[PDB]
Design a protein around this ligand. Structure first.
Ligand code: 2HG
Ligand code: MN
Lengths: 18, 429
């Protein structure tokens, strides 16, 4: 699930460390 | 102060203290040698193994290398595998393992550790809260909900468990029920409750039910540093970028893109209408709970800076036209999509996730009356063959009360003040 028009997911990005 | 040394570790506390001292003095490589030395000589020592892990952690920080940190994650696990591990050390080791797994994006691995932690320490309420986060991070809100329900069944005034339960409820469109949890959780002031997400969604929930106190919470969220303003409430922002709800083509500097869109608009329209007639399924219903009522669907060509090749089969000339403008086709925090909206549609006041994009609206099929879009405090209308531009990180609202359908073309662009390296590095949304 991705945040496209809104902010409904708990987190909208995928993290990759440093 | 935690008890980290089992019976045998206290007999060697001298050597372990000396190795730790080297790590806290910053001499990091000296410290790993010391701890790998102790690990060889005392292979069952949990503290020596924990020390090796911590030093690998510090070393990854100094080098900023995910490489090194993946090693620390296995050593943290090695600690828990050893005999006679003190409970405090066992919990510290596996928690840092889960935290660093999340730092790396290994959300399914972090979840596995969290589940282990909860079984080992079944009376620790804080770890069940952490476990719920692990579920949320993989998109498993069903299990996240049950976790926070159990937490509330034992410690019903746990603020952290309240906001996250409210967040889950609101995401499932149980708006009224969400409000008390979000509100009471923010007011508890517990650690983890001062988060923009919960201000954002409490205010939205209040707006949807007509509660006029909503901007009371947007105000406080602005005062506490989560929102750039009470009107612009995006949460994935590059601070400093010029903020205003509406823009002109010159103000963005994307004047060639705008010209290309307006000069070739009938072509863009015709390919969208062709998909409506012969490939209806490519239009997907809006699935973010942004509608009060009505029908609203989008046909997406680019998302997160990725061309959808099957989608572009249906708008081939449009996709070819757009390929000339990397400011949009390379905008990994926006989309390019057709958007159709039918009469009887009202889109709730809402905000986009990021201030790092601007949103262009090209009019394709616009009824003479009944369609309008508000952003901040100015409301405007679409025109066939003309481009509107607004910053959708500001609150915006849309109505459709015409007697026929309304079709527009949406083109997101990087905020113009973002630098080439920013556009190349910022995580996609
Ligand atoms: O599709 C539309 O009509 C506009 C929707 C609006 O929320 C947007 O982000 O552009
Ligand atoms: Mn929107």
């Amino acid at each position: 699930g991705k945040c496209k028009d809104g902010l409904g997911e708990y987190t909208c990005t995928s993290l990759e460390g440093f | 102060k935690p008890k980290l040394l089992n019976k045998f570790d206290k007999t060697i506390k001298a050597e372990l203290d000396a190795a730790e001292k080297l790590r806290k003095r910053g001499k990091i490589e000296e410290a790993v040698n010391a701890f790998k030395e102790l690990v060889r000589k005392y292979p069952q020592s949990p503290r020596a193994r924990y020390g090796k892990a911590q030093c690998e952690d510090d070393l990854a920080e100094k080098r900023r290398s995910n490489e090194v940190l993946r090693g620390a994650i296995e050593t943290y696990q090695e600690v828990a595998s050893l005999p006679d591990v003190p409970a405090d050390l066992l919990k510290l080791s596996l928690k840092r393992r889960s935290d660093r797994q999340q730092f790396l994006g290994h959300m399914r691995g972090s979840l596995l550790t969290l589940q282990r932690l909860v079984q080992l320490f079944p009376n620790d309420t804080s770890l069940k809260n952490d476990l719920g986060v692990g579920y949320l991070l993989i998109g498993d809100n069903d299990n996240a909900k049950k976790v926070y329900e159990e937490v509330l069944s034992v410690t019903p005034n746990d603020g952290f468990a309240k906001v996250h339960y409210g967040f889950i409820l609101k995401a499932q469109n149980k708006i009224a029920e969400s409000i008390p949890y979000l509100k009471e959780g923010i007011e508890s002031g517990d650690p983890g409750t001062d988060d923009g997400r919960f201000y954002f969604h409490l205010g939205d929930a209040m707006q949807r039910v007509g509660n006029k106190e909503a901007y009371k919470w947007y105000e406080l969220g602005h005062k506490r540093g989560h929102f750039a303003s009470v009107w612009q409430r995006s949460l994935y922002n590059v601070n400093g970028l010029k903020a205003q709800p509406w823009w002109t083509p010159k103000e963005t500097g994307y004047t060639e893109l705008v010209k290309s869109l307006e000069r070739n608009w009938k072509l863009i329209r015709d390919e969208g209408l062709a998909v409506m007639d012969k490939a209806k399924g490519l239009f997907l219903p809006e699935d973010e709970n942004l509608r009060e009522k009505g029908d609203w669907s989008q046909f997406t060509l680019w998302q997160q800076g990725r061309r959808n090749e099957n989608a572009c089969k249906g708008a081939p000339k449009t996709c070819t036209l757009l390929e000339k403008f990397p400011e949009t086709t390379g905008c990994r925090r926006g989309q390019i999509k057709y958007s159709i909206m039918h009469p009887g549609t009202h889109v709730w006041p809402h905000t986009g996730p990021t201030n790092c994009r601007l949103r262009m609206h090209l009019g394709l099929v616009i009824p003479k009356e009944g369609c309008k879009i508000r952003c901040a405090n100015e409301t405007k209308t679409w025109e066939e063959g003309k481009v509107l531009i607004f910053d959708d990180s500001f609150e915006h609202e849309v109505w459709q009360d015409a007697s026929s359908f309304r079709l527009i073309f949406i083109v997101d662009v990087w905020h113009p003040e973002l630098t080439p390296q920013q556009r190349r590095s910022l995580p996609a949304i």
